[PDB]
């Protein structure tokens, strides 16, 4: 299928084992901002669901299908590839909704649905929006979407901004400097110090932070899910030009994302911005191995390039320069191995 | 090979990616008890190494091979299956030991050595000793051992003992009772509560604890690595008869382990007991779904059965009874998915 061709079986097994756990479902359901905002988006746009046919891509426990049902959907096909499908089935029976929610086990790329659908709902966002490459499954699912069908969420905005955080930088550097030792119990480790630094700075940092560390207005890159095709996400090129508002060392870029549910009645935003209440997505920071000095009024320009890999993640390349000085930094991050710092 | 026949490729990929990170090597090197005790065992038994041929099974960064070298080994074959082999090679060159340490990339079950060896060294111990099933690779490697060759470590003792820990026990129901809600954003989740309890009780708990929670002297199960065969570890049957020293509820069994390096000059012990300084192995606790009441002087008897699975771990079955009352408890745990509670 399209899923097995873009995915190592090793990555798929680990991925679906992980989403098989009820503890993991619970962790996500307890994020009140996530769950409450999805509910608000669907219920305040009840006319986008009333008497409609719905597809839920990756329904997990089924929670979004239940929200579609509360909003009056006639029929909801809830597709789920993990063993969580069986738990979803139990809840559909115990909430007396077997007439309206139909769980269909398997990958959305491999199953057959009996009907085209009016609206697709999902939670395909990973860290930094794109991690897990579940957005591809969500877009693939448009093959079941009626002409002029909607998607919830409808659009995703990635935000990037340069930051300064000396303590974060030093934490990671200090960990790599373990490999400087010329005599660790009598053994010289120092030839691996370079590789150790590479490895630590390759890890994106998932945590929150105070917005004061941001040194310029964010740049926005928008994916419109109504119009994008799965192959658009194999290679994502994000040019950026920051107008520096504060002088200081730039230790890297911070990422967060918003999605909008663009309904008939109203548009509801789910934000993971550091100005907004915290979600289980936190925010994400990619450190530069060598920080760049910049003055207020300078321009920091470059490119964030995401290349999809077969481990359901992305190789991240960030090249940035201070235009006024020609000072450049180049970085490769492996979004599959983030450092969870909270 | 013997390795690929007992192992899902999905488990092997995850396993070797994990040991490929220098951060993970560093975590193990920084465990002072681990590293210092291996060094003491090898250096204080210099006659087991001086001018000898050595095999290092799963050398990682190469640290144990360097210790063999400091003790006078003529030749050390250092076998490693992860991408860590390349980093080990760099360290052998930077420490000017290419004449003495030969790194051989690949599984010890698949590679070729040019000669038989006088002694095998390794750190095959996982959680509860047996997790990761690397003891099998260690024993398999005896095919390269000269008649009357040694092994470091020489023997491994698993210890089990009943414990009481009311707070730990209760934490499981507290977590699962998230599902005992008739209207979570309008959805009745209560049908999944039993399955959530099942899932948490299947997880062994990896953390440390105060020795006062132990309710009887440990029982010991010993593997002699000079004499054991690979197949002896596929099914491990540990009968137990505890003579209760304290009255209370028994919430489960605690596990820890010791290994001994039995050299020509001295025997050195590496212990992970809760009476001893803490290591990165901690200790492990398996809860019973139903606790058993026992009085001081009663006998709690039964069996701990470890059955090897293809995810490089074990299914753990524990059946226990208080002989004086006939009250019984039976429990199945998945050692692959431990709960890290520290
Ligand atoms: N990063 C955080 N925190 N959350 C990201 C959202 C996690 N999301 C939970 C959604 C519950 N509302 C993943 C679920 O979608 C399922 N799934 C994935 N890919 C497929 C596929 N190709 N076909 C069918 N199902 C798939 C997965 O098994 C899991 O149940
Ligand atoms: N902290 C816990 N819990 N355990 C410690 C793990 C000990 N150890 C670190 C070594 C430093 N002395 C594991 C290494 O052995 C390697 N490895 C495993 N199995 C094989 C095999 N069948 N053939 C070849 N190499 C193998 C693995 O790649 C890894 O580097």
PDB file of C-alpha atoms in Angstrom, chain A residues 24 142 160 180 235:
ATOM      1  CA  UNK A  24      -1.221   6.562  26.091  1.00  0.00           C
ATOM      2  CA  UNK A 142      -9.241  12.447   0.721  1.00  0.00           C
ATOM      3  CA  UNK A 160       9.368  29.326  13.742  1.00  0.00           C
ATOM      4  CA  UNK A 180      36.550  15.163  26.080  1.00  0.00           C
ATOM      5  CA  UNK A 235       9.957  17.383   1.174  1.00  0.00           C
TER       6      UNK A 235
END
